[PDB]
Amino acid sequence: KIHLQYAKAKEADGRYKEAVVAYENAKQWQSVIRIYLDHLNNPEKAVNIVRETQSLDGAKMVARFFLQLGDYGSAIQFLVMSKCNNEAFTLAQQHNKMEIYADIIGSEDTTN
Distance CA 5, CA 63 (A): 29
Residue of 39, 38, 58 whose CA lies nearest to 48: 58
Instruction: Show me where the chain is broken: residue before each gap, C-N > 2.5 A.
Output: none
User: 15: Cβ–Cβ under 8 A, 6 or more apart, which residues?
Assistant: none
Resolution in angstroms comes to 4.3
Element containing residue 8 per DSSP (H, E): helix 2-13
Distance CA 57, CA 53 (A): 12
Amino acid, single-letter form, for residue 18 = E
**Is the separation of the CB atoms in 59 and 44 below 8 Å?**
no
Distance CA 60, CA 8 (A): 23
Q: What's the CA angle centered on 15, arms 50 and 68, to 5 degrees?
A: 45
Number of alpha carbons in the 13 Å side-chain half-sphere of residue 96: 0
CA distances from 99 to 54, 64, 83, 89 (A): 27, 21, 20, 10
**Is the separation of the CB atoms in 4 and 30 below 8 Å?**
no
